[PDB]
């Protein structure tokens, strides 16, 4: 009645008992599995809040204490008087860490307890929101010694619109639809680029132009804010032994900072709560640079390497991709900017799974996102069966505000 899970490299078997507590429902049925798809009232607020309060008082060894029951009654009474409730500062910190811990697609969760939580729930305007965001970027970047962080802006509440960051990440390169239909820059960012221009941004014409932030205060149009260039640390890409690689003029930014996800804690929703960590090298080298629908550099690099691109069996794509990933790792290490390779990251994720089996009886994990996009079966997570399910607190997708 609890899923049995095998690791095929060692022979291990565990049972994921935590999955039986899964609090919301996913896309799969006994009919059909949809695991590979990218996108899968006071009483119900109270029951969500009650579960989270139970989690919080369990974590501090105060389950069933005087303070525990008091907090339950306080929330009950605030939901009856106001239709909502406010988290205490310690509850917010706990909830943000649990949301990361619970994120099935994150291979970086060995780190979940080391998260700096900035409380911006008093934020008042898009201009104050910008200042909070700049300081998050400065703290998290830390001159290349990256530190995980999240900034939480005010929750959704009755009577008011949302705070929203329109950008999908705090640092993103412009994607300029050009008139053939090609894109100069990042094709993933064509939409937000057009929105920025529409709100008064004077565009560039380079491949690596950092976009401005579009920031929305409750019941206000979004407002455009240019990031100070010295806050955006970037890494020019070179290769340790292919000297022509630097002449590609490729770059990437230090800080991966997701800004468009919804943070849900105890039934409360925080539509603006950007979080950042540090990159895994395959995110940059394999996906961002080599996806055919992104920068798509693979064939240019292969031609430069003198590989035989006329036949698939020469494995020219694999050879070129390896050297691009080498170039990313080398360049970030040379620049003294935190980066993790996919072998170290998946090894640390295996330790996380062992930690979590002891702590909670399992760990929600999405195999297709945990296994790296190159060298899959060379990493230990390939051979680990995984159980995917939804726990709260959680980071959730939400529709684009436009």
Ligand X SMILES: C[C@H](O)[C@H](O)[C@H]1CNc2nc(N)[nH]c(=O)c2N1
Ligand Y SMILES: Cc1cc(N)nc(CCc2cc(CC[C@H]3CCN3C)cc(F)c2F)c1
| Binding footprint of ligand Y on the chain (CB under 6 A) | 38, 256, 258, 261, 275-277, 279-280, 283
Using CB positions, name the residue nearest to ligand X: 369
Provide, rounded to whole angstroms, the least separation between the CB of residue 391 and a copy of itself.
Answer: 11
Tokens of 367: 């195999």
Residue 300 in the binding site for Gd ion (CB under 5 A): no
Our CB check for ligand HEM shows the closer of 84 and 259 to be: 259
Interior angle at CA 288, CA 284 and CA 294, nearest 5: 165
Phi, psi of 169 (to 5 degrees): -135, 160
The answer to whether 99 contacts a copy of itself (rule: CB under 8 A) is no
Bridge-based pairing state of the strands 183-185 and 175-177 = antiparallel
Size of the site for a copy of itself (CB under 8 A): 68
Please, which residue, 223 or 238, has the CB nearer to Gd ion?
238
Report the residue number, 212 or 277, with the smaller CB distance to ligand Y: 277
* E strand or H helix that includes residue 340: strand 339-340
CB 321 within 8 A of CB 374: yes
Q: Give the nearer residue to ligand X in terms of CB position, either 52 or 279.
A: 279
Given the complex with a copy of itself, which of 67 and 378 has the nearer CB atom? Answer: 378
Interatomic CA distance for residues 282 and 340, integer angstroms: 9
Among 241, 292, 358, 399, the residue binding Gd ion under the rule CB under 5 A is 241
Contact flag: residue 60 with a copy of itself (CB under 8 A):
no
Closest Cα partner for 111 from 368, 340, 334?
340
| Residue 369 binds which of Gd ion, ligand X, Zn ion, none (CB < 5-8 A, kind-dependent) | ligand X
- Omega within 30 of 0 (cis) for the link into 393: yes
241 binds, among ligand X, a copy of itself, Gd ion, none (CB under 5 to 8 A by kind): Gd ion
Q: Does residue 96 contact residue 115 with C-beta atoms inside 8 Å?
A: yes
Per CB under 5 A, 35 contacts Zn ion: yes
Residues acting as catalytic residues: 106, 109, 278, 283
Residue 381 CB, nearest approach to ligand X (Å): 8
51 binds a copy of itself (CB under 8 A): no
Q: Is residue 229 packed enough to be buried (19+ CB in 10 Å), middle (13-18) or exposed (0-12)?
A: exposed
Can residue 348 be called a binding residue for a copy of itself (CB under 8 A)?
Answer: no
* Residue with tokens 């230990």, as numbered in its chain: 380
Site size for Zn ion (CB under 5 A) = 3
Tell me how far apart the alpha carbons of residues 171 and 254 are, in angstroms, rounded to a whole number.
9
154 contact choice in Gd ion, ligand HEM, Zn ion, none (CB below 5 to 8 Å, kind-dependent):
none
Show the tokens assigned to 96.
Answer: 């943000």
* Cβ-contact 84, 77 below 8 angstroms: no
We find the least distance from the C-beta atom of residue 254 to a copy of itself, in angstroms, to be: 17
Contact residues: Zn ion, CB under 5 A: 28, 33, 35
């Amino acid at each position: 009645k609890f899923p049995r899970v095998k690791n095929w490299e060692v022979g291990s078997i565990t049972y994921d008992t935590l999955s039986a507590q899964a609090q919301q429902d996913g896309p799969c049925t006994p009919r059909r599995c949809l695991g590979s798809l990218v996108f899968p009232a006071p009483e119900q607020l109270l029951s969500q809040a009650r579960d989270f309060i139970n989690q919080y008082y369990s974590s501090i060894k105060r389950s069933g204490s005087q303070a525990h029951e008091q907090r339950l009654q306080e929330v009950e009474a605030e939901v009856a008087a106001t239709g909502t409730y406010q988290l205490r500062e310690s509850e917010l910190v706990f909830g943000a860490k649990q949301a990361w811990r619970n994120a099935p697609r994150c291979v970086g969760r060995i780190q979940w307890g080391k998260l700096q939580v900035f409380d911006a729930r008093d934020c008042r305007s898009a201009q104050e929101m910008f200042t909070y965001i700049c300081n998050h970027i400065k703290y998290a970047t830390n001159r290349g010694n990256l530190r995980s962080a999240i900034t939480v802006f005010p929750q959704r509440c009755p009577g008011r619109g949302d705070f929203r960051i329109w950008n999908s990440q705090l640092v993103r390169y412009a994607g300029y639809r050009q008139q053939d239909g090609s894109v100069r820059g990042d094709p993933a960012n064509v939409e937000i680029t057009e929105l920025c221009i529409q709100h008064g941004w004077t565009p560039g014409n380079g491949r690596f132009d950092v976009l401005p932030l579009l920031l929305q205060a409750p019941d206000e149009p979004p407002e455009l804010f240019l990031l100070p260039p010295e806050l955006v640390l970037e890494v020019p890409l070179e290769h340790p032994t292919l000297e022509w690689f630097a002449a590609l003029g490729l770059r990437w930014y230090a800080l991966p900072a997701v800004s468009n996800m919804l943070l849900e804690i105890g039934g409360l929703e925080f539509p603006a709560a950007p979080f950042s960590g540090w990159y895994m090298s395959t995110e940059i080298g394999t996906r961002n640079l080599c996806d055919p629908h992104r920068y798509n550099i693979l064939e240019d690099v292969a031609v430069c390497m003198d590989l035989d691109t006329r036949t698939t069996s020469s494995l020219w794509k694999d050879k070129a991709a390896v050297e691009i990933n080498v170039a990313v790792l080398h360049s970030y290490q040379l620049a003294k900017v935190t980066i993790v390779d996919h072998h170290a990251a998946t090894a640390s994720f295996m330790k996380h799974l062992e930690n979590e089996q002891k702590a909670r009886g399992g760990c929600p994990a999405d195999w297709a996102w945990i296994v790296p996009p190159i060298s899959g079966s060379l990493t230990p997570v390939f051979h680990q069966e995984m159980v995917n399910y939804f726990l709260s607190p959680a980071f959730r997708y939400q529709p684009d505000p436009w």
